[PDB]
Design a protein around this ligand. Structure first.
Ligand SMILES: *[C@H](CCC(=O)O)CC[C@@H](*)CCC(=O)O
Ligand SMILES: *[C@H](CCC(=O)O)CC[C@@H](*)CCC(=O)O
Ligand SMILES: *[C@H](CCC(=O)O)CC[C@@H](*)CCC(=O)O
Ligand SMILES: *[C@H](CCC(=O)O)CC[C@H](*)CCC(=O)O
Ligand SMILES: *[C@H](CCC(=O)O)CC[C@H](*)CCC(=O)O
Ligand SMILES: *[C@H](CCC(=O)O)CC[C@H](*)CCC(=O)O
Ligand SMILES: [Mg+2]
Ligand SMILES: [Mg+2]
Ligand SMILES: [Mg+2]
Ligand SMILES: [Mg+2]
Ligand SMILES: [Mg+2]
Ligand SMILES: [Mg+2]
Ligand SMILES: [Zn+2]
Ligand SMILES: [Zn+2]
Ligand SMILES: [Zn+2]
Ligand SMILES: [Zn+2]
Ligand SMILES: [Zn+2]
Ligand SMILES: [Zn+2]
Lengths: 323, 323, 323, 323, 323, 323
């Protein structure tokens, strides 16, 4: 036939394909979510998340050295609480689990980039991301508490305060609180566009989130692309240093759209449900885990993500699959 | 706190959330892929795709009636061949499996829109998508055969000829071929952006594709977003009635970029691999299948797809989960 | 002939057309304007609006249950006043018609989305949308009163306070008033771009608006597309949760232009004159009412409207034409 | 209140509003559709279109003179045939009704710009816009006939050949045809975006279109905005001198999107249905006809139309409402 | 001070800076230019390009093995001719220097991607890029010869034919030529935007280009940014597989503008002059060579280049500075 | 061959090329960086910068007259300090070197445009661009001092205060300080996008900057194009009269991108390392200095720069190469 344009020409050998590959993925693009449980002794496997385990607080100094030695540059701290209550106040206790997780990480590996998850769903008896009032989760009462938690996490050494409470004005609240306390240099990794997804089941199992209803009244609608952009642009306006799309996997259209609407760095969270789905199809022998993980993380980068929160990070690190 | 902008205002209730939902998913958005195996008697279960079975040719009249009864408006045919050879010539035999799958569907259900997968990987002894040469899969030898297959399938009643060979100029070749033989009205549903993905394992099992190596010399690189758009715009230029992104789940950024680059309809294939990861994670009790399937399909719609190829379409239709 | 591109290919059967339909319309997209008259006993037909009737206040609890049972998710309340005066002060009487209409609706169907029309043209002896002063309608005196009305409507349970007075700064005024009174969660459905149209005659008949001149000094010029966009973008800037184009029917260019200029939800009002025109041509046997209604509402959605205010809503609901 | 931006500032008076009016409507924006019935003696009233009458061929010289005297710069001819058949061949008879309507207009008023409707629904026994086949309306059989009709109408003096058959490739066919016969200077006014609307009932009555079914296999879907633009850009590509959206009243979003996609002139047809809804609502005394006609026509201008096809053009011209 | 936005927040440490680095440079981004001199025995040092030497043809098998061992994925061949003449015919001799440089590279290292410089300035007695006429370099006489050279080099194994003659229509000429001779799969790497720069002195020394005058009648003006884009888009239109900007260092604005105007791969040539200025400044001890080379190459990547032609590639590869 | 488009047509003679040259460079586009050393007697050559010399303060009145007489319209003052200390306080001494350099220039040539470099790296014992604190360079303590320096430089007659400290909020700080002191007319030439480049070695030698580490914690990452734009747009937002990209040479993609994102004038700094690289390759006889300088400065203008800071300026001036 007569065809002048032939895409296949640059696909002929592995060398040609390597030369013309548009997107690349490094170990640097990954942030490792870590689960830390206070007052316990043995690491606990998370069933819903094949390979993940809660790290006993007594072993955190050891795991963070392990992670750092594998080449992971950053972690996101999630605690499993034994001092839950109606407001999740242990989260702003200058010495509670949240402060302690940071303290230990920064003390152990000074150069480790410590992002402290900032919410209450893991510290409240009801499992909601804030103060429950007659109304539902109280936005402004929760903003107050998110700010106090911010200051003690910054106090403990957290490099980024990451609000995941899906509260309006949360970035502004945390920025003023940090500044007022002399933490004007502490960064905010906002979970800016965070969907009321059905892919967090494994995570809730892993983190001990005691919730029976849903978070549909704060986390946003999965179907709303316009609203998703506006959620992130409001956070940019309130001073976030980095934005984020959560989940990442089934939202790369949102990542790409946001990429074109801001100059800010954009993070993407490869959530627990996405991890479970790769892990369980691999164990059923349906897919090649490694090929599927690399393709998935590669797609997230291709969509425009600057950083990817991924539970596969340390394995990828240690098995020298990514450098 | 001071906030005039409060996104949560429209999230207060189920009624408010429904009123402001930006994207909708319905049954007419779905196209159901079916596997038909010739010269066989019982339905065969696909191991890697729980719930999916090869339909015996003898029972296709029965199944396409069932499918149609469920509300499914369309199907994509894939045959499992017992007449494979060097060039996959059974596919262009006037009464080969390709032509008969269409014939039995259109004759049983005249209203059923039948899209006929158009390739050779299911009919070649080597498992590759075309004619082999010392070269690798020979582009132009394959184009002639795609043309021949197009006319017999068109003659057999197929409403869409869907070339999935990833051959340069395939749409033009098939357009020229159908036109000359008097099928100027038969449409082309081009797998215009078809990535050399690792998510097709389950499908190859289901369709009996005898491939030992890879398809990287013709299916495109997963990392190449600019190339992906160019791939589809070259097919729009060639006359394609509908364009397509495959896989869809991890390529929503592609679907969205493409939506902004053409006025043509865009299909998105929720591949066997995606189906597999959802089913095994649900079997493992880690996620809720239905909520995860609906979220997954809704995101593909959200990203810009007009039609979605889903192996979940029949259950969603019969269980009246989508109307 | 030789034509590669053939649009007609996807128009061959009802099935194909259904698969390729770009826009859809659900019962969810509709908001039902309701006319409630205090101190009366029998429902009154509105002559200019064939099929519409004023609901006696004593029957409102009954009609709102009827509407809600038909599946309508939201209503817009308009009262016919028997206590008109120079400033329309019954509108901010904590117990006047406006408060009462809301009170009754929310008390009867707690989940009903109650949008309270916010103006004075129905409560003033002169029929103008505010305070008449030497000058004409006094913008700032009217802003004051619009805020007080907002608080009592929010107090009564209105979900959205909908200013239709076409007063500059009305959204800002209503937002500060609501916030100050502890109604920071009450939404604003601004009639942001509201034209000085000649299509409201039937509505004025239906609502008892006692006006002899025009509203050309506040409602904007029908011919000004640039000004129309700016009117809506100013409201976005002042905190509106939802914007609106009124009328909708002969302004879909304005709807589409606004759609591309904001991420906010956009409402469109299918006004009384548009309803009368469909109703009277149908009664003269000139057109098919149902086909024309569905095509018109479908066009409004196609233009970019997220919600449509429509008097045909309950019929469409009950006759199961829309679900 | 504090507001530096007050849109009402330029709305204070009639002089200020006129000075800032963005869009203008004049008589030269209007094209007058006329119905001419052959072999008949008295004017026939169109029931569904009050004020509209079939003009007897014998009286056309008289009427086109009247029209021209009124200031009308152009007309679109529609003939009511007494010579219908299977293929609508009277339309391409050198002296058939199509050719004579043009001839009598150009010869009576040499300056009159005559646009000749170019189709077969008014000349076929079955009422469809072309040649029927087992298929439905045969596209390419019809294109040949459109070509033949184009040359006789061109030869008869028509200034524009306006194909309203909704056939793929109609503009190219008619361009090729006129060119070969030496009418390289005759223009094409393409009904480029012609929707399968329900607003044409009154017109079919007025023009005697013997159709029992629908035109959905060729006129396009009302819901398809992206397809609508593609429809017109394919005609610009084919050489069309002017493009068009029909209907116009409920498709102003289309007109505006198209205005932004081409530098070509764009016509908009205010259809019989729109005319009917305005007239019957005015008869019912529900709206003011003149104010509603002027607003309706002004919105079509506002949306981007260069020319408007209106059945109100003559009254507006004679009553000196437009100059 | 009051500042919510503090860019320095993500600059606090080496880890934070790496995590937020937007652009990456790797070894696969580099293509290594090599100078091969025929009929000679020892390596010759290039004075003006410290570190660069003419490789004796006899030692090419050895060197391409060394290059390939280092990790270099590709080279661009430039031969120093001992058979120059009026038309540069040695270049299209089936076994001329051009064909043999390719042959020895592909045969020694089958995986090596060989791009063959395609011109006549190194083979013509007058030193100009083609056939001379009273005119100056004759465009179309040269195109024929570029075509002839393309096929022998293609036949010899070259993976890319890279026309650097700056002839109008060179890509089409070479595409037509390779196609006819059965090299439809051989690619074209067009020096699409090739400026008449003053930075090529060192290269001419290294490649033995016998030119006394200038190339301004064919290489384009350095000041013309709009012309530069037009130059490359005409080559994309002609079928070029990859486009290119030369020089690259002082034309990063061009590279970036071009990146936004095409989806095609874009190469950028870090010319001999740039290489020379870096080396001599480093020799003079004024700058750090490595830091300056890495910054220079990283900026070309940053600006949008997919591939970079660099004379520093081998040292960077062997010293393991890039992987 | 057949080619309609022939770029070469406008390249045939020097006259044609001159007519079609898109970009031009005048002496007006250049700003001359001057090095002034207090308490010394003989001009000192800067080894790293062939041709540049520190001007003894006692000779400044003489050199500025020389510069002005050559036609240079503006200079950028850099001092070599003999009164360095921990905070660089001599920089805000109403009579220190910074004040004095300006004083002398404006006193000598009243019409000379005096841009005073505003930092501390030349006045601090540690060589950092501000106040060193436990943390690193203290952003806010440095902002304080940058403001005081601004007022005394404005006091001395500087026309532009040019902050090069890469401190967040520096433009805002300097603007408030200037305004408060009655210097609301003094302009700010912000070094808005200033990279942590490896091309400043020669400058540091020339300016006596006593730094042993790097400026990576304030000057921005060379690889971050998105951040580069945001750095400049923040300065526009804080009131800068002119923006700047530094370095210029290997950042013309950044210059072009910024050009398209602001209406503000954009300056570009052809840094010392770029000067050294041209000078040393010219001395090694590798390139033609003049041709390379003119091409480089011409590229900077082509990329979008309105003013270029260049050390070659006075030579270009005196040798009448630029007027
Ligand atoms: C937000 C969502 C948590 C929840 O709603 O339970 C913060 C945690 C994100 C990670 C969830 C996951 O990895 O599934
Ligand atoms: C604004 C216009 C009312 C008026 O000017 O009388 C608020 C009511 C909109 C609906 C009017 C209608 O449906 O005609
Ligand atoms: C900023 C950079 C100076 C440094 O970091 O030493 C202000 C001076 C710019 C000119 C530097 C040069 O010309 O190299
Ligand atoms: C594409 C090629 C599939 C393959 O096996 O390479 C055409 C069929 C797409 C379906 C694949 C799937 O569902 O996994
Ligand atoms: C389009 C087809 C009309 C039809 O009856 O299908 C060409 C004529 C447009 C005028 C229709 C009207 O005015 O209603
Ligand atoms: C372009 C022409 C070079 C010339 O000498 O005119 C093709 C080769 C580019 C390399 C030039 C260099 O590296 O300086
Ligand atoms: Mg938010
Ligand atoms: Mg293709
Ligand atoms: Mg307003
Ligand atoms: Mg058409
Ligand atoms: Mg060229
Ligand atoms: Mg800055
Ligand atoms: Zn939470
Ligand atoms: Zn295949
Ligand atoms: Zn009102
Ligand atoms: Zn017709
Ligand atoms: Zn050359
Ligand atoms: Zn400094």
């Amino acid at each position: 036939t007569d065809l002048i344009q032939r895409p296949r020409r640059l696909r002929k050998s592995p060398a040609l394909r390597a030369m013309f590959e548009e997107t690349t993925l490094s170990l640097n693009d990954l942030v490792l979510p870590i689960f830390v449980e206070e007052e316990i002794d043995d690491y606990k496997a998370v069933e819903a998340m094949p390979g993940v385990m809660r790290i006993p607080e007594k072993h955190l100094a050891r795991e963070i050295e392990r992670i750092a030695n594998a080449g992971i540059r950053s972690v996101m701290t999630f605690g499993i609480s034994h001092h839950t209550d109606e407001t999740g106040s242990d989260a702003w206790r200058e010495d509670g689990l949240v402060a302690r997780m940071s303290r230990i990480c920064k003390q152990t590996v000074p150069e480790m980039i410590v992002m402290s998850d900032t919410c209450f769903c893991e510290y409240t008896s009801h499992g909601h991301c804030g103060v429950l009032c007659e109304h539902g989760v109280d936005n402004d009462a929760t903003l107050e508490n998110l700010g106090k938690q911010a200051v003690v996490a910054a106090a403990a050494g957290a490099d980024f305060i990451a609000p995941s409470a899906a509260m309006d004005g949360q970035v502004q609240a945390i920025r003023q609180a940090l500044d007022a306390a002399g933490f004007k240099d502490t960064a905010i990794m906002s979970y800016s566009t965070k969907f009321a997804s059905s892919f967090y089941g494994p995570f809730r199992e892993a983190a001990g989130s005691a919730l029976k209803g849903d978070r549909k009244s704060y986390q946003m609608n999965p179907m709303n692309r316009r609203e998703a952009i506006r959620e992130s642009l409001l956070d940019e306006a309130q001073g976030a240093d980095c934005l984020m799309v959560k989940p990442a996997g089934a939202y790369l259209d949102i990542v790409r759209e946001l990429r074109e609407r801001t100059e800010l760095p954009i993070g993407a969270y490869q959530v627990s449900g996405e991890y479970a789905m790769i892990k369980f199809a691999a164990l059923a022998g349906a897919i090649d885990e490694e090929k599927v993980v690399l393709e998935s993380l590669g797609s997230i980068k291709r969509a425009g993500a600057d950083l990817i929160f991924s539970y596969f990070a340390l394995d990828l690190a240690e098995k020298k699959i990514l450098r």
